[PDB]
From a paper:
Conserved in both motile and primary cilia, the doublet is the elementary cytoskeleton of the cilium, comprising α- and β-tubulin heterodimers, forming a complete 13-protofilaments (PFs) A-tubule and an incomplete 10-PFs B-tubule. The outstanding stability of the doublet is likely linked to microtubule inner proteins (MIPs), which bind firmly to the inner wall of the doublet microtubule. In this study, we obtain high-resolution structures of multiple repeat units of the doublet by single particle cryo-electron microscopy (cryo-EM), reveal the remarkable interactions at the outer junction, and discover an inner sheath of MIPs inside the doublet. To structurally analyse the doublet, cilia were isolated from Tetrahymena thermophila and split into individual doublets using ATP treatment.
Micrographs of the vitrified doublets were acquired and the density map of the doublet was reconstructed from the 8-nm non-overlapping segments by single particle analysis at 5.7 Å overall resolution. However, the resolution was limited for accurate modelling of the tubulin dimer. To obtain a higher resolution structure of tubulin for modelling, we generated the PF map by boxing out each PF from the doublet density map, aligning and averaging. This led to the map of the PF at 4.6 Å resolution. T. thermophila tubulin dimer structure was modelled based on previous tubulin structure and refined using PHENIX.refine17 in this PF map. The above tubulin model was then fitted to the doublet density map to construct a pseudo-atomic model of the doublet. Tubulin model structures fitted well in the doublet map except for PF-B1 (discussed later).
Residue numbers in the entry:
A (entry chain B): 1 to 429
B (entry chain A): 1 to 441
Write the structure that this text describes.
């Protein structure tokens, strides 16, 4: 039915989806136990395309658990809504990748892929007209990417028609949570540029910036952050989940978002984002949220539209309004800062609306535009990879996995090729 | 599922071990006999004690660690001590006549005497265990078996399993303070036979323990009780991830080829804090930034080798308690900020966060005050080669004078072991010499 599935690895991402399904449960108001306690059939109408009824009305996720060590499995296993799960999917590891990506990709990569792809495949038979599935990990290591690389390869072959919308955490330029990041990252991204269908960037520092400045929060954790992102990743299917006077699916999205298949790394904007007092400063209009939409500070990725140029831009609106406003602000904005709008893409802004906003708010905005400002991102990470690969720093942890360096060259001149590729598209008219 | 096991050797070494298992048993609060004060509820999500404290069919939960040393007096004190309900007889293997600090004796001479018993015990535990990640081995370049017999120990244990991690806690000859003079012999003879049988290990020196406990713990007159307590804390936190929920429950194997990027120079420093008094617990606040900026005080450096004379490579500031990713994170920016510090630039950043949510527990009768947040700066730099150089120069001359050599030649070692082992520190001097070279252009 255009239903989809979720698969998460990732040192964080395993938590991320926990929050995610948590949020969707709220938007479906079904008890933690797994039965519905809401007030409209509309939550039940399209419930299946994420959930699954069970005998007795156990309502369940179409999620897939990735992990190389059960702790997360216990963690979310210790999770509220944990009784809303299926024990089947608790597919984890006994070792951990140690985030040498070769470890999580050959060593443990080849070790535990099979049981996953089997049960996942059983989910594939459980899906009537599968629009797709949602993968989640991080692009700097192996706790997610280790195996998730193998996932994208295997299912991608196994389902060359299905959509692969991939969110994985990008290392911020400043803070290096690990120094093996350039290598895991580069080795992964070689794969992901080939095999993944959609990708959107996952920085932490942006999420900090949101929580601290625009959220005006002092105490950052993951969980709030995954609230902030699963807000958007939860919004994305809204029309696909719920009616909309102007609907567009991921196929309409990506096909209406990408000129050439190498450009499915997208940046993200969601809003509104206030602290409590703000409403008693300000109110909500479509033009208002628009005035956030093109905010670099909501630009939750390491790329700057202020520095790069919008190759593409789009808006995901959930609520009840007048599109006569919506479009009007659209075109207005597409003029107002025309210069950061790439040229030969006429009407490079594109529209949407969901008859219902997310719960709690009256109107919704989402922006997954695609400039080319990410070039500094790949340039950076490739740069650090370059330095220590001059040094071969921690190659020994690496070659101990029994990869070659020439692969590193492959993702290397590879990833540079993708960058310059974005250069010419940005530098053209 | 996630096991480790501790090995204990040398007088100071098993002193450390005693402090440690006192500690952990305190920290899970399982009573010294082997029972917990109360019943254990059935739950899931992560392991517990099961790592180390050994489940029985009843309130008997013994460590997963082993004693081995050829100087069996003191260990008997454990054989007598309060935890004589705690430990287990077959947990105990000792030698009667120790090495006399002949490396070559308990390594060669008495090296032959207890090995098989050791390996059988190891097989009993690892066979008892499932997902034992790595090996906690403790010894000392002083209590002589701590050098010699341990040297054979890893020398063979590595060849037994291999795939386990080598968790190395041994003590290093204090720079000017000491215990003997054959220490050169113990150390370097250990070292050339240490390295290729070692995965990674840290070097704890005492004089720092003194100076810092006396200033920072406000200690007037310390000893191995305080020392063993302090290392008790540091190991207490170096493995919390496998014991307690933390945001980034990093792991040893994870640490291995990432902290020590190359294979060779795979040791490090470790300055834990916050060690303060009850009168500094109050009159203070002990910020994340205070532990953090304080974490890199060279004068806080818990092994007498100046960081400021070296260039850092990695820093795994695993944290206990109420830690914020952001706050620490910006502190790490602050660490990038430190002009005086200089990093193996070809490893620009190699950082690796640790935010475990349990703040520290304190041992009654101790001198450390209670806090909310712990740091372990397991960091690796260029600096530490120098004191080695002192070791090989001291040993250089003394060996040149053939001092004591009769003792060792009497027990079955050859001279080329000596000069060649000096070639060993020659090479490692080339290693700290070279890796510190900044890659050209
Ligand atoms: Mg002894």
């Amino acid at each position: 039915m255009r239903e989809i599935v979720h698969i998460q690895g990732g040192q964080c991402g395993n938590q991320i989806g926990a929050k995610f399904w948590e949020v969707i449960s709220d938007e479906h108001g079904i008890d933690p136990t797994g039965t519905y306690h809401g007030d409209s059939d509309l939550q039940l109408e399209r419930i299946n395309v994420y959930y699954n009824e069970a005998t007795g009305g156990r309502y369940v996720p179409r999620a897939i658990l990735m992990d190389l060590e059960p702790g997360t499995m216990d963690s979310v296993r210790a999770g509220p809504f944990g009784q809303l799960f299926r024990p089947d999917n608790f597919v984890f590891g006994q070792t951990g990748a140690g985030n040498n990506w070769a470890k999580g990709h050959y060593t443990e990569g080849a070790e535990l892929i099979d049981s996953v792809l089997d049960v996942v495949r059983k989910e594939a038979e459980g899906c009537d007209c599968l629009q797709g599935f949602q993968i989640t990990h991080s692009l700097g290591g192996g706790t997610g990417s280790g195996m998730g690389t193998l996932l994208i390869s295997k299912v991608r072959e196994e389902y060359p028609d299905r959509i692969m919308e991939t969110f994985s955490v990008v290392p911020s330029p400043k803070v290096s949570d690990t120094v093996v990041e350039p290598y895991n990252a580069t080795l992964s991204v070689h794969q992901l540029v080939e095999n993944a269908d959609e990708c959107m960037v996952i920085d932490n520092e942006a999420l900090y910036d949101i929580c601290f400045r625009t959220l005006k929060l002092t105490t950052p954790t993951y969980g709030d952050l995954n609230h902030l992102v699963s807000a958007a990743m939860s919004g994305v299917t809204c029309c696909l989940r719920f009616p909309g006077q102007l609907n567009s699916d991921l196929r309409k999205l990506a096909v209406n978002l990408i000129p050439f298949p190498r450009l499915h790394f997208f940046m993200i904007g969601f809003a509104p984002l206030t602290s409590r007092g703000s409403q008693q400063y300000r109110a909500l209009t479509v033009p208002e949220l628009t005035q956030q939409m093109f905010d670099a500070k909501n630009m939750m990725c390491a790329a700057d539209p202020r520095h790069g140029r919008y190759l593409t831009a789009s808006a995901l609106f959930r609520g009840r309004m007048s599109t006569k406003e919506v479009d009007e602000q659209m075109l207005n904005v597409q003029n107002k800062n025309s210069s950061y709008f790439v040229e030969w893409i006429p009407n490079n802004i594109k529209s949407s609306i969901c008859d219902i906003p997310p719960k709690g708010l009256k109107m919704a905005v989402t922006f997954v535009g695609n400039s080319t400002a990410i070039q500094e991102m790949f340039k950076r990470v490739a740069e650090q990879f370059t330095a220590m690969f001059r040094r071969k720093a921690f190659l020994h942890w690496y070659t101990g996995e029994g990869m070659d360096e020439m692969e590193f060259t492959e993702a290397e001149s590879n990833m540079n090729d993708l960058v310059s590729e974005y250069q010419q598209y940005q530098d053209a008219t | 599922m996630r096991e480790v096991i501790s090995i204990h050797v040398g007088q100071g070494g098993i002193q450390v071990g005693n402090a440690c298992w006192e500690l952990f048993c305190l920290e899970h609060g399982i009573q010294p006999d082997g029972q917990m004060p109360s019943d254990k509820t059935i739950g899931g999500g992560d392991d517990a004690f099961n790592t180390f404290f050994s489940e029985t069919g009843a309130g008997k939960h013994v460590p997963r660690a082993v004693f081995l040393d050829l100087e069996p007096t003191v260990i008997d004190e454990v054989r007598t001590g309060t935890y004589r309900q705690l430990f287990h007889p077959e947990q105990l293997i000792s030698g009667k006549e120790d090495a006399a600090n002949n490396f070559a004796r308990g390594h060669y001479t008495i090296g032959k005497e207890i090995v098989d018993l050791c390996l059988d015990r190891i097989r009993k535990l690892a066979d008892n265990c499932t997902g034992l990640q790595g090996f906690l081995v403790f010894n000392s370049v002083g209590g002589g078996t701590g050098s010699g017999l341990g040297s054979l120990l890893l020398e063979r244990l590595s060849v037994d399993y291999g795939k386990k991690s080598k968790l190395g806690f041994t003590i290093y000859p204090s720079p000017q303070v000491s215990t003997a003079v054959v220490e050169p012999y113990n150390s370097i003879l250990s070292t050339h036979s240490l390295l290729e049988h070692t995965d990674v290990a840290v070097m704890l020196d005492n004089e720092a323990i003194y100076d810092i406990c006396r200033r920072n713990l406000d200690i007037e007159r310390p000893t191995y009780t305080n020392l063993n307590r302090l290392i008790a804390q540091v190991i207490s936190s170096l493995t919390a991830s496998l014991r307690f929920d933390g945001a980034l429950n990093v792991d040893i194997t994870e640490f291995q080829t990432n902290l020590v990027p190359y294979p060779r120079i795979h040791f490090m420093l470790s300055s834990y804090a916050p060690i303060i008094s009850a009168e500094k617990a109050y009159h203070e606040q002990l910020s994340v930034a205070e532990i953090t900026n304080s974490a890199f005080e060279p004068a806080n450096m818990m092994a007498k080798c100046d960081p400021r004379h070296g260039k850092y490579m990695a820093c795994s500031m695993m944290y206990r308690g109420d830690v914020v990713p952001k706050d620490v994170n910006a502190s790490i920016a602050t660490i990038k900020t430190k002009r005086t510090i200089q990093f193996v630039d070809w490893c620009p950043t190699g950082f690796k966060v640790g935010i475990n949510y349990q703040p520290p527990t304190v041992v009654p009768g101790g001198d450390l005050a209670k806090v909310m947040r712990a740091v372990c700066m397991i960091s690796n730099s260029t600096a530490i080669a120098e004191v080695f150089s002192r070791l090989d120069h001291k040993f250089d001359l003394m060996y040149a004078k053939r001092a004591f050599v009769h003792w060792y030649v009497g027990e079955g070692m050859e001279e080329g072991e000596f000069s060649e082992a000096r070639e060993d520190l020659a090479a490692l001097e080339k290693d700290y010499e070279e890796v510190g070279i900044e890659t050209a252009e």
